[PDB]
């Protein structure tokens, strides 16, 4: 029964998920002065040309755009990663106001939203096995700022009316996630966790330095979603972000 409210939000999660207080929790604040350039990293290989989107789901916490991950169709490689990670879904976190919403912060700055493209390590065969491994997942995180509209987002915005409430899904085929990327693939990377329960410490985080711009109208449509199910009291789906967690014994590396 976890969520983002006063009674079930991030300050409560540790009671059911004690790893909430673990050594490699996400998100974190990225201190851009302390992050060290790691000339040994590599360029990110983002290979989304064959991506096959299937469906969009309101899961009561966010909405997920789901992909066919039954073969190596959309994969992330290179950078800090060893081997091949397959795209399974993307989702966002966003705020009630444009001054909050991101999970990661940059020198304590909060962005209006954050996109997470979730990928699993094919050496573990399936997502459920991958999340049990310290190198099981690679999540590409992209900040969103409010300014100009992001044309590649509007097809997502267009369908939200059809998945207003928890448990609703819609067909979402032929969506190209390349239209969500910024121009630069410069990034920060560190070892962390899922940012929602079960908070498993299985993620290599790759956070792009360049935000994408979306319009005020695009984000306002995110904020019309509901956390609740159909015919239940309306609770707007806003402020679905976990705040920054202790960095502990970790180093954030810069690709640039
Ligand atoms: Ir309850
Ligand atoms: Zn996320």
From Swiss-Prot:
Q: Which residues form the active site?
A: 61
Effect the entry attributes to changing residue 59 to A: Reduced activity
Q: Which residues bind substrate?
A: 195-196
GO term, biological process aspect, one = positive regulation of dipeptide transmembrane transport
Instruction: Spell out the reaction equation it catalyses.
Output: hydrogencarbonate + H(+) = CO2 + H2O; urea = cyanamide + H2O
Q: What is the effect of changing residue 91 to C/D/E/N/Q?
A: Strongly reduced CO(2) hydrase and p-nitrophenyl acetate esterase activities, impaired stability of zinc binding
Major enzyme class: lyase
Q: Which UniProt keywords apply?
A: Acetylation, Cell membrane, Cytoplasm, Disease variant, Lyase, Membrane, Metal-binding, Osteopetrosis, Phosphoprotein, Zinc
- Tell me what happens on changing residue 15 to E: In Jogjakarta
**Site feature (Involved in the binding of some activators, including histamine and L-histidine) residues:** 89
Site described as Fine-tunes the proton-transfer properties of H-64, located at 4, 59, 64
The record's GO molecular-function terms, alphabetically, read: arylesterase activity; carbonate dehydratase activity; cyanamide hydratase activity; zinc ion binding
Q: What is the effect of changing residue 61 to W?
A: Impaired activity, rescued by 4-methylimidazole (4-MI). Impaired activity, not rescued by 4-methylimidazole (4-MI)
Known outcome of mutating residue 59 to T: Reduced activity
Name the source's superkingdom: Eukaryota
Annotated Gene Ontology cellular component terms: apical part of cell; cytoplasm; cytosol; extracellular exosome; myelin sheath; plasma membrane
Quote the SMART domains the UniProt record gives: Carb_anhydrase
Record's family? Belongs to the alpha-carbonic anhydrase family.
Q: What is this protein called?
A: Carbonic anhydrase 2
Q: Which organism is it from?
A: Homo sapiens (Human)
Q: Which gene is transcribed and translated to give this protein?
A: CA2
């Amino acid at each position: 029964h976890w969520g983002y409210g006063k009674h079930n939000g991030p300050e409560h999660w540790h009671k059911d998920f004690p790893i909430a207080k673990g050594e490699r929790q996400s998100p974190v604040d990225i201190d851009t002065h302390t992050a060290k350039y790691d000339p040994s990293l590599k360029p990110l290989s983002v290979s989304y040309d064959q991506a096959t989107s299937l469906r969009i789901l309101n899961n009561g916490h966010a909405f997920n755009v789901e992909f066919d991950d039954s073969q190596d169709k959309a994969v992330l490689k290179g950078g800090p990663l060893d081997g091949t990670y397959r795209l399974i879904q993307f989702h966002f976190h966003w705020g009630s106001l444009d001054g909050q919403g991101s999970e990661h912060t940059v020198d304590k700055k909060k962005y209006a939203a954050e996109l997470h493209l979730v990928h699993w390590n094919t050496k573990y065969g399936d997502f459920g096995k991958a999340v049990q491994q310290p190198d099981g997942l690679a999540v590409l995180g992209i900040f969103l700022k409010v300014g100009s509209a992001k044309p590649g987002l509007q097809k997502v915005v267009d369908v939200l009316d059809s998945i207003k409430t928890k448990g609703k899904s819609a067909d979402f085929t032929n969506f190209d996630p390349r239209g969500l990327l910024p121009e630069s693939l410069d990034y920060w990377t560190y070892p962390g966790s899922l940012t929602t329960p079960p908070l498993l410490e299985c993620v290599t985080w790759i956070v792009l330095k360049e935000p994408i711009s979306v319009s005020s109208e695009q984000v306002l449509k995110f904020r019309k979603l509901n956390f609740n199910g159909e015919g239940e009291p309306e609770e707007l789906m806003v402020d679905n972000w976990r705040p920054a967690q202790p960095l502990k014994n970790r180093q954030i590396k810069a690709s640039f």
